[PDB]
Design a protein around this ligand. Structure first.
Ligand code: HEM
Ligand SMILES: *[C@@H]1O[C@H](CO)[C@@H](O[C@@H]2O[C@H](CO)[C@@H](O[C@H]3O[C@H](CO)[C@@H](O)[C@H](O)[C@@H]3O)[C@H](O)[C@H]2NC(C)=O)[C@H](O)[C@H]1NC(C)=O
Ligand SMILES: *[C@@H]1O[C@H](CO)[C@@H](O[C@@H]2O[C@H](CO)[C@@H](O[C@H]3O[C@H](CO)[C@@H](O)[C@H](O)[C@@H]3O)[C@H](O)[C@H]2NC(C)=O)[C@H](O)[C@H]1NC(C)=O
Ligand SMILES: *[C@@H]1O[C@H](CO)[C@@H](O[C@@H]2O[C@H](CO)[C@@H](O)[C@H](O)[C@H]2NC(C)=O)[C@H](O)[C@H]1NC(C)=O
Ligand SMILES: *[C@@H]1O[C@H](CO)[C@@H](O[C@@H]2O[C@H](CO)[C@@H](O)[C@H](O)[C@H]2NC(C)=O)[C@H](O)[C@H]1NC(C)=O
Ligand SMILES: N=NC(=O)c1ccncc1
Ligand SMILES: [Ca+2]
Length: 595
């Protein structure tokens, strides 16, 4: 115990220390310990991993081996019995726009990514797993329980591959298994710019010396830009409609095209960067290209952090916000800014907020066309609807005018995700996000629910009666007990999300604690936190608290009526105001004079 050694995946760089800009890999943020918070390093472990063989074999891997005496139940069985429901009526969040959910997915994607293992392009293991479901090495399939309707239709399992791990990737040995975070821990807009110098460069337009991001050349959205198309074939975006042949978008983060709405938001940010850059060029004619890139980049980062901490978190945590995130006192170099392995599962509460359908609205916020409301599942890796069916304006209005889904103990995840999820790799619209989340909890060797309740100083129920009290639900507590036999065994993903919500928030006591700590840490340990004295100027900071997502919309679409508070539920037209009634980000404080 104490390694500090093991680390084949660098890639290492030299630190400048007087550079006023963040590296792209996240390196050099912390001067004493320069790799803290960098992309491609192990996720942090707040608690010792809990694997079946104590090292890397996940629970449920070996049939004959129990966990605390009992067999862990199949991911899908838990999915079938606890997580799914049929009635979408009455399910929407009365005070959260659809944007509430989509911002979460953006933030989370800026902070973490544990990609799956490769070791296979020109591979049969990709197929010895999909076709016959043989568990082995990195294939760790999700078996269907008896009486599951996907048996008669899909096969005997859903292919699933274990997450990538530090040092090698290969067979391997030694210490406990640690998963990789392929992105930077700092809230630094890494999802727009990339986390590798390799990708960050491809993304840029180095033809023009104006510091812009490369835009699409085959198509436009009323003279406005779109993200470039990705080079790679086979592309999944052209697969869902072999006819329209539209590839996925190339963006800072690889998951950008996962669903039409996420792609949309990515477009807004790409656009704000370029707009920000042509404006800086206008007041500092003399600045060079990189100067424009970095400074534009720097602003957008500050923007993502403000919206997130000022607008978003307080309605996620509710009354529990001040208790985990006291006000900012300044940079603290003794804080571990690394994303913990558990945070990547607690932040998945967002999955219970995804509604079953997506809408496009017209200028008066009316159904745009005859097939205006689409089932969420026709939108996974759907790029052609944007390019070939209206642009993003119709979708952005839907973001502002529709509601998020409200987590609900009797109605957790929509069937659009629990039964019809499309994986970029396989061919069917038949995966189960819920089962995958659970299978991945085990892949990552996460401690049980009660381990996490103790961590947060919350009571730990040992009995049915005990758990009814904490969940405030007899039916749920029961279902759960029958499957897991002991609360010690409840997987944290479902454990945390089953708890009733906190006052004015959207997650419970356990999740609030986990989320709260993480964010406190990425703020306090981020040398480039926007409020950190010296990072920006007093006059610059003053201009930055006037940013709002509403404005972002005005400056980058042709939408003219927007809500003043985009995250709460807004009705058209009473709640919407004209874009000219809205605080603009004044860039005058970024002007630079010679003598
Ligand atoms: C329609 C919207 C969404 C889709 C289709 C979707 C789908 C997925 C899929 C397929 C995974 C990978 C699961 C695995 O292999 O472990 C994933 C991961 C994840 N989702 Fe989403 N998701 C959506 C929305 C959201 C939202 C709103 C949030 C949070 C507010 C969220 C948080 C996460 C997080 C934190 C992960 C783990 C990231 C990592 O690997 O580090 N997701 N999602
Ligand atoms: C729907 O959600 C809204 C936000 O979740 C909620 O209103 C929010 O309540 C907060 C309480 O802190 C208010 O914040 C500001 O309140 C005073 C003025 O009363 C200001 O001087 C302070 O700056 C303080 O930050 C807001 O009025 C509001 N949040 C925002 C900015 O939108 C609604 O009440 C919810 N709807 C219902 C009826 O449940
Ligand atoms: C695959 O992508 C196709 C488009 O890329 C899509 O079809 C398109 O959408 C409809 C067909 O249902 C047509 O749109 C409208 O065209 C005129 C108005 O401009 C109307 O007269 C038509 O009635 C229709 O409403 C497009 O012409 C059509 N585009 C093409 C080239 O076919 C397919 O539906 C997609 N298929 C799948 C499986 O999603
Ligand atoms: C990189 O930047 C250059 C220069 O701004 C872009 O060239 C412009 O392209 C737009 C859109 O096609 C046209 O209005 C002009 O023909 C060009 N203007 C200038 C200033 O030359 C180029 O399209 C960008 N390339 C990428 C991949 O984004
Ligand atoms: C920076 O963060 C550290 C660690 O998070 C804080 O250190 C605490 O110091 C107190 C003494 O005041 C000790 O009792 C604790 O052991 C430390 N807490 C923890 C959880 O590590 C410290 O509060 C911060 N530094 C400053 C001065 O702001
Ligand atoms: N269907 N898969 C994805 O690529 C993905 C999309 C969003 N978040 C994580 C993974
Ligand atoms: Ca980041």
């Amino acid at each position: 115990s104490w390694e500090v050694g093991c680390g084949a995946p660098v890639p290492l760089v030299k630190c400048d220390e007087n550079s006023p800009y963040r590296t792209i890999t996240g390196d050099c943020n912390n001067r004493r310990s320069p790799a803290l918070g960098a992309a491609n390093r192990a996720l942090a472990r707040w608690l010792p991993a809990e694997y079946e063989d104590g090292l890397a074999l996940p629970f449920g891997w070996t049939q004959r081996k129990t966990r605390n005496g009992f067999r862990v139940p199949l991911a899908r069985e838990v999915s079938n019995k606890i997580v799914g429901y049929l009635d979408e009526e009455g399910v929407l969040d009365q005070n959260r726009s659809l944007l509430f959910m989509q911002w979460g997915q953006i933030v989370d994607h800026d902070l973490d990514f544990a990609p799956e293992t490769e070791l296979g392009s020109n591979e049969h293991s990709k197929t010895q797993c999909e076709e016959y479901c043989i568990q082995g090495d990195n294939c760790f399939p999700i078996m269907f329980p008896k009486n599951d309707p996907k048996l008669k239709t899909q096969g005997k399992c859903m292919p699933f591959f274990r997450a990538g791990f530090v040092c090698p990737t290969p067979p391997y040995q030694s210490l406990a298994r640690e998963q990789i975070n392929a992105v930077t821990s700092f809230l630094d807009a890494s999802l727009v710019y990339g986390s590798e110098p390799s990708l960050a460069s491809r993304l840029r337009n180095l033809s023009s010396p104006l510091g812009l991001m490369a835009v699409n050349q085959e198509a436009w959205d009323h003279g406005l830009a779109y993200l470039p198309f990705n080079n790679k074939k086979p592309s999944p975006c052209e697969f869902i409609n072999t006819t329209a042949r539209v590839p996925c978008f190339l963006a800072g983060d690889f998951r950008a095209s996962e669903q039409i709405l996420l792609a949309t938001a990515h477009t807004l940010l790409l656009r704000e960067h370029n707009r920000l850059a042509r404006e800086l060029k206008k007041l500092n004619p003399h600045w060079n290209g990189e100067k424009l890139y970095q400074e534009a980049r720097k602003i957008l980062g500050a923007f993502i952090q403000i919206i997130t901490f000022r607008d978003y978190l307080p309605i996620v945590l509710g009354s529990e916000m001040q208790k985990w995130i006291p006000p900012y006192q300044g940079y603290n170099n003794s804080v571990d800014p690394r994303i913990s392995n558990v945070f990547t599962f607690a932040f998945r509460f967002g999955h219970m907020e995804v509604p079953s359908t997506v809408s496009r609205l017209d200028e008066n916020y009316q159904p745009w066309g005859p097939e205006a409301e689409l089932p969420l599942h026709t939108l996974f890796f759907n790029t052609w609807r944007i390019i070939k069916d209206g642009g993003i304006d119709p979708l952005v209005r839907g973001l502002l005018a529709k509601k998020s889904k409200l987590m609900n103990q009797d109605k957790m995840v929509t069937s659009e995700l629990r039964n019809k999820l499309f994986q970029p790799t396989h061919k069917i619209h038949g995966f189960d996000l819920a089962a995958i989340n659970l299978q991945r909890c085990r892949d990552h060797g996460m401690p049980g629910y009660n381990s996490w309740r103790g961590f947060c100083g919350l009571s730990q129920p040992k009995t049915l009666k005990g758990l009814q009290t904490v969940l405030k639900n007899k039916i749920l507590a029961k279902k759960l007990m029958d499957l897991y036999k002991t609360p010690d065994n409840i997987d944290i993903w479902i454990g945390g999300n089953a708890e009733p919500m906190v006052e004015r928030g959207r997650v419970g006591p356990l999740l609030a604690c986990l989320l709260g700590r993480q964010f406190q840490q990425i703020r306090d340990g981020d040398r480039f936190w926007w409020e950190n004295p010296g990072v920006f100027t007093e006059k610059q900071r003053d201009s930055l608290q006037k940013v709002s997502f509403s404005r972002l919309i005005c400056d980058n679409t042709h939408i003219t009526k927007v809500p003043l508070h985009a995250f709460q539920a807004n009705n058209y037209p009473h709640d919407f105001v004209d874009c000219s009634t809205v605080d603009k980000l004044d860039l005058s404080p970024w002007a630079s004079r010679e003598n």
